[PDB]
């Protein structure tokens, strides 16, 4: 019944060699609709990197590691993740949360040029990564919100001045975005919300793997589906056999616990 989460052909979720190879940069792109939110996937990834496996999903002793996670959100405050991760017993010294909800508009936006806004955000990331450069994952939730919060910001400026530099500084970057804009009935996201839609397309193109959560189109037994798919870019890896193991899982999330299983 219950399945383990597997992303890659070596049976791993977050390959340790993604952090030992060097000059390598890999982007995971996770998309979800707003009725199938990703908190449990975010936690599981942090769990994987820090504790060593996605135990909340697959199934343990005190352990110690250098492995570190930088967590950023444009829609959730710091307490949200701090509480979530405490409940999973992730050691607070193995992660850092960057809050781009709290006071963000009143500080970082109001009366301030686009370029300076983006440069300041990036600087917060750089400071965070600077400590543990090669054993750190970076997770960033809803950066596309900047396209709405910042007057006249184009997708290409967001990528050129923030996303791409960020990725160039990371072993592994995980972008988490809300795909509601593609799911309005009678409305063509391509034509009319092109600035916003470009972000999802370009993110996909740069990623080596795409995880997407959606409600089913066709039970109380099931929250939705998780698809695991190749992204548009090759995996940056010495291991020439490493590939994405594409998959579809159904999952049920309830009472703060999640179970993956097959159709």
């Amino acid at each position: 019944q219950r399945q383990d989460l597997v992303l890659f052909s070596d049976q791993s979720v977050l390959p340790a060699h993604f952090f030992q190879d060097s000059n390598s940069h890999n982007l995971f792109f996770i998309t979800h609709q707003s009725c199938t939110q990703p908190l449990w996937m975010i936690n599981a990834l942090v769990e994987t990197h820090v504790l060593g496996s996605p135990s909340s999903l697959n199934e343990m002793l005190p352990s110690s590691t250098r492995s570190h996670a930088v967590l950023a959100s444009f829609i959730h405050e710091q307490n949200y993740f701090t509480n979530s991760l405490n409940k999973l017993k992730i050691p607070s010294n193995n992660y850092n949360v960057l809050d781009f909800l709290s006071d963000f508009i009143v500080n970082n936006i109001h009366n301030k040029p686009r370029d300076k806004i983006l440069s300041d955000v990036l600087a917060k990331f750089s400071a965070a990564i600077q400590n543990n450069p090669t054993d750190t994952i970076v997770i960033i939730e809803q950066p596309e919100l900047l396209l709405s919060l910042v007057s006249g910001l184009t997708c290409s400026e967001l990528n050129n001045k923030f996303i791409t530099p960020l990725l160039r500084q990371c072993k592994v970057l995980i972008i988490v975005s809300n795909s509601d804009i593609f799911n309005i009935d009678e409305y063509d996201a391509s034509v009319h919300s092109s600035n916003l839609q470009n972000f999802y397309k370009s993110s996909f193109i740069k990623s080596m793997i795409n995880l997407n959560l959606n409600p089913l189109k066709t039970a109380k037994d099931v929250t939705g589906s998780l698809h695991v798919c190749r992204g548009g870019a090759p995996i940056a890896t010495s291991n020439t056999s490493l590939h994405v193991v594409e998959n579809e899982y159904l999952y049920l999330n309830e009472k703060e616990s999640t179970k993956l299983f097959y159709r």
């Binding site: 050129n160 530099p165 795909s179 593609f182 397309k201 370009s202 698809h227 190749r230 548009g232």
Partner: protein, 221 residues
């Protein structure tokens, strides 16, 4: 004579940069990106014994390709500087390949200028345009970027996914419209439409299935 005897051999000559094409335009989409085709270029252009220096221009590539001789990060610097830099890596002297990862990042009204400053008898430019990334008044009749790019190109290679599963083309279309990305895309085996624009001005079209694993190309419709 009016159409190719062996289109596969033509294809290979273009891939190997033997046949001259100063601007080769690759069209791709999220269902099948261009980097595998680019790999076919470098492969064929070494497997007929060539050894071209390759200048790689990156708007969206953070991992430096192994085949490249020079690498330029275009994301921080402006248009004039970028052109300067590209030229500074170019030259009789020898044959260079200039690869641009995405033409979507260059403003439409700069396209012709870009192509004209870079152009040279020693330069072949290979450039990718993503068909599904939208460009960034009412009596402005300048052609859209794709229309213009196709007009300026000497060779066009239009890349499409080849579907193996149980979803047909239109089903995958609607799924992709909802960003419900299906399995079965971005494969080693994919489809290619070649438009070769001859010296005579005539544009000839051929379809190929390409296996980027074995480097075997076969003909289609």
């Amino acid at each position: 004579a009016s159409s190719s005897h062996n289109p596969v051999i033509l294809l290979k000559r273009i891939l190997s940069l033997t046949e001259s094409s100063p601007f080769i335009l690759c069209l791709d989409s999220i269902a099948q990106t261009s980097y595998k085709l680019i790999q076919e270029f470098v492969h064929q252009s070494k497997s007929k014994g060539n050894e071209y220096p390759i200048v790689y221009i990156s708007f969206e590539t953070v991992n430096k390709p192994s085949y490249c001789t020079q690498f330029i990060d275009a994301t921080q610097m402006d248009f004039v500087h970028l052109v300067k830099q590209i030229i500074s890596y170019l030259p009789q002297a020898k044959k260079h390949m200039v690869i641009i990862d995405s033409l979507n990042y260059i403003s439409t009204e700069y396209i012709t200028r870009f192509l004209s400053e870079i152009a040279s008898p020693h330069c072949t430019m290979v450039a990718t345009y993503h068909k599904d990334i939208k460009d960034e008044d009412w009596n402005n009749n300048y052609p859209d970027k794709l229309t213009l790019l196709q007009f300026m190109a000497t060779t066009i290679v239009d890349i499409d996914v080849v579907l193996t599963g149980t979803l047909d083309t239109e089903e995958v279309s609607e799924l992709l419209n909802e960003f419900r990305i299906p399995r079965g895309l971005n494969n080693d085996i994919f489809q290619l439409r070649l438009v070769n624009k001859r010296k005579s001005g005539r544009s000839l079209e051929y379809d190929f299935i390409v296996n980027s694993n074995t480097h075997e190309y076969e003909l289609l419709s």
